[PDB]
């Protein structure tokens, strides 16, 4: 599945 990856990507914000 890609749910988890999608969640982690949405929360990642290293700027």
């Amino acid at each position, epitope marked *: 599945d890609g749910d988890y990856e999608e969640l982690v990507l949405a929360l990642r914000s*290293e700027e």
Partner: antibody
Amino acid sequence: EVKLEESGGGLVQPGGSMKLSCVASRFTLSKYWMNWVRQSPEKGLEWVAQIRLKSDNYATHYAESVKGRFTISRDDSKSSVYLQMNNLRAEDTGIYYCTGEIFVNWGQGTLVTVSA
Amino acid sequence: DIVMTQAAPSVPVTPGESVSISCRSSKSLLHSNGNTYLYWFLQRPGQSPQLLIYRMSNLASGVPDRFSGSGSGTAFTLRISRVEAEDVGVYYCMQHLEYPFTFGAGTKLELKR
């Protein structure tokens, strides 16, 4: 379904070295930042180190108590991350957990005891 | 050097009643969005910590919907509406706004009887 599994702990002499391993199953490790966190009765939970992805040039960040002595690393093709611990101090005793990027997935932890 | 303060080392609760667990940060955890960089964890005895709440108020998947999290900048509250025995353990907050990530000292939930 995701599983992290750390190994390598045990009893070690002050000033000695020890390398911990963490192997991930059902989890494409290369996509996630990884962390080590340790636990003791003395200090509770302490974040230890972090490693980012290959495209971040594997950037690392460390706790102050551990800078210069611990090296976190990763090998995506072995689905593993590592913590090389040198010049071990008695203060480093505790349970060492590896965790994913957002702290949902944790291993069972491996116990490191530094004593003479 | 963000210090996370959990005033209460323990809290007693009558089963089926509510409880609040507080945490305080020496500095605002609001990142330049509507995002507050605060996690809540539960560590049941003899087990690894597990995530209850991310971004201060979002339930992680699989966490029972009787948990909620709230807060404003520097003061945060984890709430359980109806405590089950599933819920006994140690609750920790953690900030990841800045390196080093830092944990509160934990609040232990005890059942009344």
